[model samples]
Target: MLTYGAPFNFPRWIDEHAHLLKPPVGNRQVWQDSDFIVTVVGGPNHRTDYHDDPLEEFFYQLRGNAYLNLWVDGRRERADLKEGDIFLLPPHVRHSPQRPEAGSACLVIERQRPAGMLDGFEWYCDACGHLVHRVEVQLKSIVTDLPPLFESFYASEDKRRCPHCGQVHPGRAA
Candidate 1:
């Protein structure tokens, strides 16, 4: 989805990506095929897991407040993002960004994945931290490429109910 061949001068406003926003208003890639993959992500995200990418992502809050939740060295850490705040996440860090406020948006900058680098999606029990489901994928189109993979874990009761502590992940259907 790279859109860089010959570059002239024009204003590519963040609001322009509003049309490309994902279901329930999520990530909208600003442009494609550039040195960096820039996205204007809109959210009140329903993600219940952490994303493990092969490259570091730079985040800059654009509108509202949110939290960058991290799974660090098997422990949990949180980085709060008020408007105008910026945070950079390491490639190895597992992160689940919580953007619960309506109209909240952020800018995420990262490089596109390479041939062998697979993006990981891992879900852990909210109550017990028990690993529930995990998968690695070659993400192409973020909008249409995710839901099918999500069906595997979310469709199962066993996957929703954690064995470690008997705590069930109140499935996203809520």
Candidate 2:
């Protein structure tokens, strides 16, 4: 947990704590409830899958640059994020995150899921742009609930294979 509503120099704290280096894409929760959630995320070396949340999210770059790759209207797009950059993502838009090594961080603010709303992770075939698989879940804790879905998706050949293209995704190991 983190101190709330305080004038804390987050970048200095992050540099000193050095906690976000774990998982290569670590995150710290500042506040969370049924209404809204706030979190700070570390940069990852590689891009993860496109995630579509039930609500729109605001991302504020804190340190190094960030590249937000999105799947919009059946095509791919990108947001080149620099320090102090801020933007909002619409609900149900698919997004993938990428960041450079060392000192890359972002503040993410989004509403908590209402009852019956589900968050989703979708993987597309790298070869043919066809749907590979999708996992939908009721988000409880972003730190706990999300990683397992990615592990499952990457581990299972059945889930990684594209039905239309019949191509198998050579996913990376956890």
Candidate 3:
């Protein structure tokens, strides 16, 4: 039921002219003329890392399971999705989707915005060994400093400091 195309509803054009660009994780459409693109993802839990896309998108999970890790307002969360789950991914908010062991297939729609908001700082975290729009630690730091009850909301342990961040949180166990 998810439609793909150039004219917003041009199914024929999409089928005839749309070029599929394959990623290490999946496939995508490059509609240079329409200024919109579509990505079809599949395979093992391959991550796109942390980065912001200037274009707005609608993601629909076609089959199996997938996780869209979104970083918004400086916080990161895992959004688990399965067949028929549809959602919009806003622009400039750091996010990425990956298929876990069970794997998944998805259709991602991207639209062009006139302001060209696509240009945002691509945060590459050496600590996490990926390109993160923002560090999860930055979010955890603020939560840990909160009142007693809320302190439980922080990642004091399960999420340990990576070898990269360990060098910085000196004296604290790595």
Candidate 4:
């Protein structure tokens, strides 16, 4: 029998590593160079970008209330994930993850997206809910590579304006 490494249990890990986990949006890797990567994501996150990637994202909600707003064939759908709820999100699905509680966190498991794979972070129109803009890039670091995408999208009228509806995306208002 092939025995893998011993398990790293939590609350003990959470107690010890509280300082390591940053607040509001922190993703600390539990497994390094492993095929199955587990990232403990601290929440109350301010991520507005909708994610459309090439891999399945398995989310295991550890604490508090969370929800995933998805665009399925141009229709809106929501998945509510309370504590102990798990969701397996498939490839090419546009998802916006929201965690709205203090001390909220989740264990996100996925494989690393390869080079040249640009995950498009898109935003839909608030009015008609049409696609407003999409920012595509090879994300090396989420904390690093995600600043200017939001700014340039909201700041520019061209990107925010929906071609289908001709409605501008609200920025200064909402």
Of the candidates shown, which would achieve the greatest lDDT relative to the real structure? 2
In model 1, where do residues sit more than 4 Å from their true spots?
A: 1-12, 16-23
Q: Encode model 4's per-residue lDDT on 89-168: one tens digit a residue.
A: 98989998876665767888987778987788888888888788887888766667877777787688998788889998
Q: At residue 125, what lDDT does model 3 achieve?
A: 43
Which candidate has the top score in TM-score?
Answer: 2
User: Could you tell me which 10 consecutive residues in candidate 2 have the lowest summed lDDT?
Assistant: 16-25
Q: Estimate, for each residue in 52-164, the C-alpha lDDT of model 2 and write its tens digit.
A: 88899999988778888888887988988888899999999898887764657788888878778999888888889887888889987877898788888878999988899
Q: Give the TM-score of candidate 4.
A: 0.82
| CA lDDT scores, all candidates in order | 0.77, 0.78, 0.49, 0.76
- lDDT string for model 1 (13-73, tens) is 5556554444565777767656588887766775777799889999999888889788988
- Point out where model 4 deviates above 4 Å: 1-7, 19-24, 32-35, 171-174
Q: How well does each candidate superpose onto the true structure, as a TM-score?
A: 0.82, 0.87, 0.52, 0.82
Name the regions of candidate 3 deviating beyond 4 angstroms.
1-25, 30-32, 101-103, 113-116, 121-174
Off by over 4 Å in 2: 1-7, 21-25, 32-34
Candidate 2 backbone collisions, by pair: none
TM-score of 2: 0.87
- Error of model 4, residue 34, in angstroms: 4.3
Q: 89, model 4: CA deviation in Å?
A: 0.5
Instruction: Please report the TM-score between candidate 1 and the true structure.
Output: 0.82
Minimal lDDT window, size 10, model 4: 18-27
Task: Report the candidate with higher TM-score, 2 versus 3.
Answer: 2
Per-residue lDDT for 65 in model 1? 84
